[PDB]
Point group: C2
Chain length 66, copies 2
């Protein structure tokens, strides 16, 4: 299901049309209090997700240099 990374921001793991997706995304809250996906986000497949993970060290380095 869902993994929160900020107010109104979630990583979601779902099966969509047979295929697994790691989705990093902004959400709105509707009037019934339900979270609904906003248009600012990205769906990654597991290989892309893997590549992201593999580069965390490099990403962190760049972030630290600021």
């Amino acid at each position: 299901a869902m993994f929160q990374i900020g107010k109104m921001r979630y990583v979601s793991v779902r099966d969509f049309k047979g295929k697994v997706l790691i989705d990093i995304r902004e959400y709105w809250m509707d009037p019934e209090g339900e979270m609904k996906p906003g248009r600012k986000g990205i769906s990654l497949n597991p290989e892309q997700w893997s590549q992201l993970k593999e580069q965390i060290s490099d990403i962190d380095d760049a972030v630290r240099k600021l």
Copy 2:
């Protein structure tokens, strides 16, 4: 700089308006072969990024059982 996680997909680390952004995003290629940012992406601040990292194990567990 930039970090590739698939065809047409890059994580970008930049300083924007005083603050650091880890930006995970889809790119188009223009006719001169240059990559340009598409609208499907998300800019994460370091706190959000931290929360993402903290939950990698849990995200992976979700993905694995699928």
